[model samples]
Target: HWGYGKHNGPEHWHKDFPIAKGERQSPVDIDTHTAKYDPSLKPLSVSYDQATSLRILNNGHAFNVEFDDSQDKAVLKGGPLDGTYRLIQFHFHWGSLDGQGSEHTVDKKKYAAELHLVHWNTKYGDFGKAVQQPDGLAVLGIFLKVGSAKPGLQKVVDVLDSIKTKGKSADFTNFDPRGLLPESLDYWTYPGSLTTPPLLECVTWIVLKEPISVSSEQVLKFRKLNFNGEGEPEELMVDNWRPAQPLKNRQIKASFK
Candidate 1:
């Protein structure tokens, strides 16, 4: 299985996954000075139903909170999207030490962590099919800064103990995703691929400008997660994030100036 170790890391991914070298790739460095502001971009509208949340699991690559996504119970609209996108899952990437882990960087500055809310276009019928098309997916990126403690994020942090081992999963529901968002809807949009392998160039990336606060102690727990399954030698899950890829000819459109 492909992992994020030095030998199988992002640099070596193209060896096995040919798409890893695609022109449109994710986790790009966002240079605010060059990003053009688009006044026509509509305000982002997100509607999430607590019941749509199914479970939280440690998938080795990262810990993710999966949603039922059977219907349009939770959807994202407006912004650079042509249609509504249904929420499928949300995940995070962090480092073992402070100040390094996020996939996307702003002004070449790396954050303590990053959060991804995965969604797929409803027009495509399902996530599997949507990912095959150019406009199939939409991923929301929110940076996590180390500062004051965030009580709103405690619910997710508390569950780490239950899912510390790879492949371990637990039933989790009744959590509204809105609580995790910042007050401002300001963001940057661009075309990119998934950071993980099978790096399909299907995602319309919406990366927020403002970062949410997290405590240093809370972030330490994220490092406790293991990539190896139970009984295997423990492999710390830090630095699972992919390095920033080239932006190429793609232009980043900002929702606000």
Candidate 2:
């Protein structure tokens, strides 16, 4: 949290975290369209066999949830994402404060923060190895905007009093992010890399353009997370997000049939 704002934003993260420079960034803006690729304009195929199980883990970094081989499960279907691709994990990227958050940028503008629902190809040897390949991973990004105030995020906020201690993790029994998604499944996709340290360059990014609104109070609660390690004085989960990176000539796509 200390390095999230001020001169410590992503621009300076490379000094302390070498791998931060290598992470695959997201939420790049889609401007300057030239129609380089074919516009098939076909509807994406949907099926009931595309779901994965879900599991919540308190990784040392943040409170995350995995979706494959877990107790709870579901399906995901699409032509671009044919066959069954199980969701692996769910994590997030946030800003130090409310106004300037998010991991992906379009024309240098931030949108609070984005939520990522991670998935992987079953062909890969579990989520561990799958995350290593370019086509091995699939993530759904949900945008969060500062709105009138949404209690929906409370599903995550209400638990702060319990896991306020660092390294303190828990399972989100019968919890689904679908409850967190906007009413629209419409999204923008592209081939890109991970947005964290050890920035791997092998992932299919599906970013939802329509963002759901959350109250400022809900966002403030997320900041209540402890920055200090266990047994240490609890600190705020101030800036949990890294800044969005450049597209590096990558082409982002969308599905509309």
Predicted structure with the largest TM-score when compared to the true one: 1
How much lDDT does each candidate structure score?
A: 0.91, 0.63
Off by over 4 Å in 2: 1-27, 32-38, 41-55, 68-72
lDDT of candidate 2?
0.63
Question: What lDDT tens digits, residue by residue, belong to model 1 across residues 164-223?
Answer: 889999988887788788888799999999999889999999999999999988898898
Q: Pick the candidate with the highest lDDT.
A: 1
Q: Write the per-residue lDDT of candidate 2 for residues 167-247, one digit (tens) a residue.
A: 666656555656677877766677776666455666777766678898888877766676566787655666667655666
Q: Estimate each model's TM-score.
A: 0.98, 0.80
Measured by TM-score, how close is model 2 to the native structure? 0.80
lDDT of 2 at 24: 45
